[PDB]
Amino acid sequence: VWVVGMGIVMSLIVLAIVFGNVLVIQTVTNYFITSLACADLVMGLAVVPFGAAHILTKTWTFGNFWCEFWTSIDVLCVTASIETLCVIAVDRYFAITSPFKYQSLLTKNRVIILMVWIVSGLTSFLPIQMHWYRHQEAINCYAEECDFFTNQAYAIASSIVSFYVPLVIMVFVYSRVFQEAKRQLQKIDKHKALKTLGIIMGTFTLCWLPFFIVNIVHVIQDNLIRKEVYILLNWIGYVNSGFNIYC
Amino acid sequence: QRNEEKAQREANKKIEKQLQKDKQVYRATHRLLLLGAGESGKSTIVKQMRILHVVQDIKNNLKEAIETIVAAMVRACYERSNEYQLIDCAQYFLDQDLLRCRVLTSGIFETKFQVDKVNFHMFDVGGQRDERRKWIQCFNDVTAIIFVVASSSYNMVIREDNQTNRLQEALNLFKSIWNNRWLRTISVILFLNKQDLLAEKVLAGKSKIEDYFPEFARYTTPEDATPEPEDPRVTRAKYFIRDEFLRISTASGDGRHYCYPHFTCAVDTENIRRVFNDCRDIIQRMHLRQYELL
Amino acid sequence: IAQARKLVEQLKMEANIDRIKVSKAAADLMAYCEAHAKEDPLLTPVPASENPFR
Amino acid sequence: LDQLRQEAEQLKNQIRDARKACADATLSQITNNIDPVGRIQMRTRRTLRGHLAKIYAMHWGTDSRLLVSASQDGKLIIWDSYTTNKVHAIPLRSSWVMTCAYAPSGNYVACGGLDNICSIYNLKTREGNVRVSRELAGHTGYLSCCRFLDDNQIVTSSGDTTCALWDIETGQQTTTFTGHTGDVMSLSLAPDTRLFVSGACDASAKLWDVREGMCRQTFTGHESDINAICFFPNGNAFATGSDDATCRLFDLRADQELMTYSHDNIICGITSVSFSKSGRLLLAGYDDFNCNVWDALKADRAGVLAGHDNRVSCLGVTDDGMAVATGSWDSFLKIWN
Ligand SMILES: Nc1nc2c(ncn2[C@@H]2O[C@H](COP(=O)(O)OP(=O)(O)OP(=O)(O)O)[C@@H](O)[C@H]2O)c(=O)[nH]1
Numbered sequence A: 001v002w003v004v005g006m007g008i009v010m011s012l013i014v015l016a017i018v019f020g021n022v023l024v025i026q027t028v029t030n031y032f033i034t035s036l037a038c039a040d041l042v043m044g045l046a047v048v049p050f051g052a053a054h055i056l057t058k059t060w061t062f063g064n065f066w067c068e069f070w071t072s073i074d075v076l077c078v079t080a081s082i083e084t085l086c087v088i089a090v091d092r093y094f095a096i097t098s099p100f101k102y103q104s105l106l107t108k109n110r111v112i113i114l115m116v117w118i119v120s121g122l123t124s125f126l127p128i129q130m131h132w133y134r135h136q137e138a139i140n141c142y143a144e145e146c147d148f149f150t151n152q153a154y155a156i157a158s159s160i161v162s163f164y165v166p167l168v169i170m171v172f173v174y175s176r177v178f179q180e181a182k183r184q185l186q187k188i189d190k191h192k193a194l195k196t197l198g199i200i201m202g203t204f205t206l207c208w209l210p211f212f213i214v215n216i217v218h219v220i221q222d223n224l225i226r227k228e229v230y231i232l233l234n235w236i237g238y239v240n241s242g243f244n245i246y247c
Numbered sequence B: 001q002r003n004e005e006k007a008q009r010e011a012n013k014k015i016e017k018q019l020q021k022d023k024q025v026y027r028a029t030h031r032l033l034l035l036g037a038g039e040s041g042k043s044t045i046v047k048q049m050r051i052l053h054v055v056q057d058i059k060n061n062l063k064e065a066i067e068t069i070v071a072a073m074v075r076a077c078y079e080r081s082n083e084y085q086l087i088d089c090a091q092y093f094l095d096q097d098l099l100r101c102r103v104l105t106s107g108i109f110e111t112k113f114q115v116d117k118v119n120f121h122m123f124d125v126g127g128q129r130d131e132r133r134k135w136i137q138c139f140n141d142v143t144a145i146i147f148v149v150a151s152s153s154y155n156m157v158i159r160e161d162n163q164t165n166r167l168q169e170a171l172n173l174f175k176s177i178w179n180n181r182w183l184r185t186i187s188v189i190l191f192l193n194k195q196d197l198l199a200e201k202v203l204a205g206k207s208k209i210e211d212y213f214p215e216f217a218r219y220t221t222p223e224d225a226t227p228e229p230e231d232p233r234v235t236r237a238k239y240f241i242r243d244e245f246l247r248i249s250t251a252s253g254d255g256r257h258y259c260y261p262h263f264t265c266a267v268d269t270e271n272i273r274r275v276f277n278d279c280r281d282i283i284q285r286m287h288l289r290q291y292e293l294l
Numbered sequence C: 001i002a003q004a005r006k007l008v009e010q011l012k013m014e015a016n017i018d019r020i021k022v023s024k025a026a027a028d029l030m031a032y033c034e035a036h037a038k039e040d041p042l043l044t045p046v047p048a049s050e051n052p053f054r
Numbered sequence D: 001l002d003q004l005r006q007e008a009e010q011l012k013n014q015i016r017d018a019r020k021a022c023a024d025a026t027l028s029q030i031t032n033n034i035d036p037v038g039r040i041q042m043r044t045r046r047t048l049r050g051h052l053a054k055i056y057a058m059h060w061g062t063d064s065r066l067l068v069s070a071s072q073d074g075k076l077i078i079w080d081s082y083t084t085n086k087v088h089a090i091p092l093r094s095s096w097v098m099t100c101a102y103a104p105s106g107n108y109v110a111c112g113g114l115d116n117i118c119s120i121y122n123l124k125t126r127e128g129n130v131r132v133s134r135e136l137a138g139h140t141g142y143l144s145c146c147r148f149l150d151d152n153q154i155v156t157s158s159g160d161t162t163c164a165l166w167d168i169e170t171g172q173q174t175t176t177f178t179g180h181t182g183d184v185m186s187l188s189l190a191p192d193t194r195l196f197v198s199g200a201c202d203a204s205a206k207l208w209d210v211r212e213g214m215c216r217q218t219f220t221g222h223e224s225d226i227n228a229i230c231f232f233p234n235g236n237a238f239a240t241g242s243d244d245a246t247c248r249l250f251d252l253r254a255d256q257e258l259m260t261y262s263h264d265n266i267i268c269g270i271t272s273v274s275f276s277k278s279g280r281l282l283l284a285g286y287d288d289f290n291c292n293v294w295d296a297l298k299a300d301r302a303g304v305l306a307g308h309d310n311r312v313s314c315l316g317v318t319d320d321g322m323a324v325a326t327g328s329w330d331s332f333l334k335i336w337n
């Protein structure tokens, strides 16, 4: 009852998220947000269904190339979604903080979305293609057809490029917008903004920040966290794709 | 024929190229509409932008001014000018020169100018008068509405005599504009014109506001007052009119409707400097509120 | 002034006109509509072959 | 003095008594015998795009293939309804336009607005360069409508309670009409181009004479402003759409109001009315973003066209009665069939 019941929840969650994301997907911001819907749809169509089957005690052992592709798609999917939020924040800062030139800076001529997607795919599929990863326990795992690991600070580059860099911009960008609103309200006179900023940023932080802490920790030192807890953290982190609060 | 349809497609392509180019310009322009009562100074403000941002008529006004004063009856009759209508630009011509003369205008009166890499479009409404103003539904997309009133005319009557004084006509018109179905999401910039004439009237003891406005007797000056330097008698009268306009806006005002009061004199070039107009036009909080409630 | 005098003269001309029964007008309208209802493309739909827009 | 006003009031009593004796029976009683038309459903065959701002006017061509539209950004685009291909895009001297027209011969286009000036353009010319021909400028107050009797005469209805019959060759007013106490908002020429009507702002519509130049009749059955008017295809009746939800049908011969069209769930206004080819359907625009189809003889709604996203401000029906075009304020035109 317990093992089967958990699979029912995860299978429903994967299917439930797919319905919401597809329905949504106008202005430049709508075109920017369309990338989030595309990434969520791709995730729900490809990665989410395999997750329950893999988490089940029996492993499918479908293949080696298919497993490599499935592992590689995770970086491309996660990096694409997180990077777009920084672009949205930058666009909002341009629109709000600088009143004229909003129209002389933003143009229809897509290009930034393609560049971001290419950058996200650069760090995902290339390590899978070259197939050179990394110990005795690390070895002999791929001989029999799933362990995850990283060496030569691959996780450090993956975390900084995909997660650490966006959050450096996020604090600086969103600090100016809130500061301007506080002084602007005083002018009219002589809570809502705070709630909006909290709703916007708390989900992102509480969903992604704890995961990469363990991601960096497990490789830096000896074994201090189990595989199951790391998998559970990843599963909790995947909720943000369906959680993404916009319109 | 095949060539007949080919030519039509080529003609369609040429027009489509120009429409895309012209779509950029229309978006990057700001449009402002003037409003107010008669003999207020809407045209003078427009002429200011031409001078800064980018002979028989003069004598004609002087010709009419001399006859008007004599008909009522010379210097003594000029002092008691409240009873009979007379042109404001009388003493200046009898004794900025091109801006003092008044010329009647029927057709729309437009103006194009650029201040800082941004195009602005200011046009006058025009016309002798209306009680219907059915064209008001056309101006449903302007960014702001500029309102100009005569702050030194509270003891003179409308051109149709035996009517309400000029100030009360402005208050009634402001209420109609504010409570309009079509103009429900347009902000208002308020210009209290003719400040120099108000100072001269208050200094002399010929007339008092308390006679025409009974409520002025018990009025106390606001604590948060900033007399720019400044007699207390002049400052108190100056602020009372400004606060009287505000109580109309705050009553029926909502989240989208705002109001910007200002003090200005139209003839002076410095007081009409579009720098504060530019700041007020860019201080609009539509950008913030909109993305998300913020 | 004389605006009423000019106006009151106009109503005299409008008053002296000939009016017919409402029944005749209704019958004429009904007869015209019944006669010309045949060639009304909007009323009775036309086949798509004969439709220039489809 | 009061005696002159007393005679004016006395005469108004005679008119009402005369109209009462001529009402033998209502139109509803006679029309009850006929069968209802039934539900009418039509779909947008084509959609015309390219305008930037709201459309305020639209007029079909003589051949019922080309139509001209006017917008608030200063553009006058001529379309091709068959294949959706623009032919011209004439810039305008001002951005405020409230009317447009199209010549019976197809060689001229008219325009006007808040500039108090009616312009005339030339389409068929040497080197294919459209240029302004004449600029009639004798008015005060905005214009509302323009019509062509031929290539040499144009009728306009300005906003100063007057109407005039112009002349392109000389640019002078041949005659002028007076008698309204409010702004004139619309007009419609007779099929024989001998008489025309005009819906003023004082809830009164008249029947002028082009040649003689004096008013003939006056109908004042409404209760609010008047925004549209259109002649019956027969030429002996017209339908009026007012500011309130009611739309009424008048008759020239009897001189009285025949029937009224209204519904309990509609409290919006009417901006444009028109008939069908045989005078059986009375289409009408509305302020609730869609269009409704009435019945001339039965006075019941028989279809709703709700493919728009903003208010409908113009409407027209082709000469052969094969299509219906409705503009709106969302910069989109449509064709229904
Ligand atoms: N002393 C003084 N006179 C002013 C000032 N502003 C306007 N005037 C006078 O008022 C005139 C302007 O009036 P108009 O241009 O007719 O203003 P308006 O009545 O709004 O314009 P219309 O409604 O289009 O007729 C100037 O020529 C001056 O005579 C001001 O600040 N000081």
Ligand SMILES: CN[C@@H]1CCc2c(ccc(O)c2O)[C@H]1O
Pocket: A074, A075, A078, A079, A148, A155, A158, A159, A162, A234
């Ligand atoms: C097993 N799930 C993977 C593993 C680690 C990882 C993910 C996403 C982005 C990265 O940069 C990563 O390093 C996760 O989706």
